[model samples]
Target: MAWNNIVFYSLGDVNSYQGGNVVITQRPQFITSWRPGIATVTWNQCNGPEFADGSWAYYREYIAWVVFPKKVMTKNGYPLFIEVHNKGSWSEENTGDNDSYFFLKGYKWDQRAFDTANLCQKPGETTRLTEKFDDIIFKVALPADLPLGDYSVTIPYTSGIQRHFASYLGARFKIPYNVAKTLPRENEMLFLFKNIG
Candidate 1:
């Protein structure tokens, strides 16, 4: 096969409660539905569209980490730095992840996510560490009023991995946001891999 396979390694979640309400409840989660050369996977089962419910995680901004099977070297033989290719008038807000930010509108949660899981993880790897833990990052923008649950996407293709090695997506579960503070802190230097460009 000429075209290689890419893995949807990890996903993130956000609170369902608004910012004003300090005592939050209900969070969104996506479990792995596929993998490569890995079997009976648990915990790091990060692939999507099968994690019971693929229609969640869009309460403003969402972030994900992907690992490509190959590395694309850059100028001067140096590993490529992080880059995002978004063709919309709206680009990423800042170098921070704020789940509370919302668009001004009458909002209603959309239970169905508008993606097929293979929305092309794009080419936005965060660091030059493609040799060991090398990977790209996706901190996408959802509808300003989007409070989706999870996505209901299909594997889309039969790559022989889902049939024999890994099992289907399941263990759909969640818990309330127990943070007393309105918003906790995630460092920028370590985390915020450049926003979607």
Candidate 2:
């Protein structure tokens, strides 16, 4: 009966490869932005409705922007785009500070480092301003000397000020992508599929 009380799985389990038809799949990656004072999650398709089996049946949360990098140090040209989940269950414990609900984080799986940020935003009074997207786009830039290896970008959720983190309904694939690079030029935006692993 709750919106956030559903579970979903990757497509790999449903469509198995046969002999040479092997299909190797990976979890999609993305980058999210909350701006200086804005705090709501907005994503593409991944956060939409679902079927009886929990598969996305429409577009709900869509990736707002895509970032491109200036340099290439790995294959796949990984794009780092930020996304937000506006599914029905987000307001789990609305206390005016929705920031505690949506989260997009990551850390180097090998280095044991961690990075997290609230994907939700409160308009006007808060320090986030979603309008900034008109001027800049999220970009990913790593040093050129770092060795290449398997790195993980992990994003999890946080609890509200007075509520505990309850994993229930809502969307599981809320994300965005951005290519590591310097800031984009004025009026010249960037897109993913340009850099990353």
Q: Which candidate gets the maximum lDDT versus the true structure?
A: 2
lDDT of 1 by residue, 1-197 (tens): 11111222222222121112111122222121222231111121223333223454311112121211112222223221223332122223322332222111111122323332332222222111111111212232222232323222111111111111112222222111221112122111111111121
Cα lDDT of all candidates, in order?
0.21, 0.24
Q: What TM-score would every model get versus the actual structure?
A: 0.15, 0.18
So what's the TM-score on candidate 1? 0.15
Superposed by TM-score, candidate 2 places the C-alpha of residue 170 at a distance from the truth, in angstroms, of 10
Model 2 poorest 10 in a row by lDDT: 8-17
1-197 per-residue lDDT for model 2 (tens digits): 22321111110001111122111132233233323332322211222222233332211222222232223223434423332323221222222331222222221111111123222322221223223222222233444443344433322221111101112323333221221111121111122121134
